[PDB]
Structure 1
């Protein structure tokens, strides 16, 4: 069997076992993929977390805001997979926005330094990861990022919505670069997933926002099940979406296709 048999795939963004990346990595491993992982803050804790995947996988440090980490990344990855071997797949599952650009804090009170850091990590970094990894990627490869539909404004998401709008633009441009390698670049726009990234009058906004997805989705939406979005990322890492790039696949129960 194995949708990803033989593929060498870099998966970023594991922080907890509820991380979307954790489930992406699990499903990928279940589908015969050979993985390499990157982690940001507390690598020791992440190692214990990543010890719970179905199989072993090298874990490397990557602070996406660090020039040196990015500069060194491709070399460190070739070490881990073996010289003369290249990546078939790259997963960007990283996002951040300071608290000030987030929930109840007034949209207008988020300082640019805070917004800029959010855009760096959640949007720009998608291009910088591509810059680093494209040199060590095989023809027919696949870059996949994580998106939340920013086409309309909403409560609480605030400046992360802007970052995702920026990220979507970046993706279309990465696709132009990636095509030179016969590599695709796409985003998976997920419904809300109960993650540790994801408070009274603001918690009221979040729940109504959440309850909306399952109501609008013709096939429903389960906030506590990360695996349909995991599967969707693997569909795109696979050879079965060979003619789609610079695009957005919506793994959201169909909520975005329905007004109510």
Structure 2
């Protein structure tokens, strides 16, 4: 077997060993994939964690907010996999919001300067990444970002909701350019996963109206999800991501696949 068998996917956004990107990559390799990898500020950290995957694989420094890594990235990657070689898949799995736009901080008190920031990171960078990586992808390719149903408002998620909505729209336009290169572009709207990022929020709000309202929300997934949802286990979202990087969903783009155990399709 080998779903991603001798395919070449740069997975981005790893920063610990239950980061979503991570279990994507793990499952990716269990699966013949052959990965490049990007990381943010503390490379050495990421670097340390990456060292834990089945097989070894290159890591390059990507601060989505500055165009020299943007401008160089396809050079570097082709360096990483050898000139006369092309990307088969790309995994966007970054995302970020100033503490002031989330959890308990009131919605109206987040200042555009910080909103601008996490949009920049969570939404726009899906496009910048696609701009730079597409010139080196093969026909039949696949780009995949990570999504959280921004479709209906909920507590705490606040402005990130707003930036995931932007995301969904950007993904749509990305799929128009992706089309020219023969390339698919989609998001996976994951149910909640226990993650560095998940606990930045769940932590940075603790004892207010929050270690609660969001608590309900949480149990709200497993209750609603006909086949259940286990926030502890990332692999189902990673398999879902793999499915889109594969060739087995050839006819789908500009689109969102919901890996949340059916929750979003259920009212209770």
Give TM-score scaled by structure 1 length.
0.99
Shift of 1:137: 0.2
In structure 1, distance between residues paired with 2:218 and 2:255? 25
Deviation (angstroms), 1:48: 0.8
CA distance in 1, matches of 2:29, 2:250: 21
Inter-partner Cα distance in structure 2 for 1:141 and 1:31? 16
Shift of 1:62: 0.3
Q: After TM superposition, give the deviation of residue 88 of structure 1 in Å.
A: 0.2
| Structure 1 spans left out of the alignment, 5+ residues | none
Offset of residue 202 of structure 1: 1.2
Is this contact kept in 1: 2:90–2:142, CA < 8 A? yes
8 Å Cα contact 2:98/2:114 also seen in 1: yes
Aligned-residue offset at 1:78: 0.2
CA shift, 1:203, in A, is 1.1
Q: CA deviation at 1:229?
A: 0.2
Matched residue SS, 1:146: strand
In structure 2, the residue matched to 1:130 is 130
Asked if 1:236 is matched to 2:244, the reply is yes
Q: CA deviation at 1:55?
A: 0.5
Q: What CA distance in whole angstroms lies between the structure 2 residues aligned with 1:28 and 1:76?
A: 21
Secondary structure at the residue paired with 1:88? strand
Q: State how far apart, in whole Å, the 1-side matches of 2:242 and 2:259 are.
A: 12
1:48-59 correspondence runs (5 A) = 48-59=48-59
Structure 2 distance, partners of 1:112, 1:27, is: 38
- Alignment partners' CA distance in 1, 2:192 and 2:214: 10
Distance 2:55 2:3 in 1: 16
- Residues 66-85 of structure 1, C-alpha deviations (whole Å, 9 max, x = no match): 11110010000000001101
Task: For residues 92-118 of structure 1, give each alpha carbon's deviation from its aligned partner in whole angstroms, at most 9, with x where no partner exists.
Answer: 000100001010000000000000001
- Whole-angstrom CA distance in 2 between matches of 1:21 and 1:7: 17
Aligned length: 260
Q: Give the distance between the partners of 2:90 and 2:213, measured in 1 at CA.
A: 34
The alpha-carbon deviation at position 200 of structure 1 amounts to 3.4
2: CA distance, partners of 1:203 / 1:113: 27
What SS is found at the alignment partner of 1:38?
Answer: strand
Shift of 1:168: 0.2
**CA distance in structure 2 between the aligned counterparts of 1:57 and 1:224, rounded to whole angstroms:** 26
Partner of 1:180: 180
Residue 197 of structure 1 aligns to a residue whose secondary structure is helix
Q: Is the 8 A contact 2:104 2:208 kept in 1?
A: no
Q: Which runs of 4+ in 1 moved over 4 A?
A: none
CA-based RMSD of the aligned residues comes to 0.5
Instruction: Give the Cα–Cα distance (whole angstroms) in 1 for the partners of residues 171 and 39 of structure 2.
Output: 22
Secondary structure of the equivalent of 2:35?
A: strand
1:188 counterpart SS class: strand
In structure 1, C-alpha distance between the alignment counterparts of 2:208 and 2:51, rounded to whole Å: 36
Of residues 218, 221, 244 in structure 2, which corresponds to 1:213? 221
The alpha carbon displacement at 1:169 in A equals 0.1
The alpha-carbon deviation at position 186 of structure 1 amounts to 0.2
Alpha-carbon distance between aligned partners in 1 of 2:82 and 2:230, rounded to the nearest angstrom: 39
Provide the rounded CA distance (Å) in 1 between the counterparts of 2:48 and 2:104. 34
3-state SS of 2:197 partner:
coil
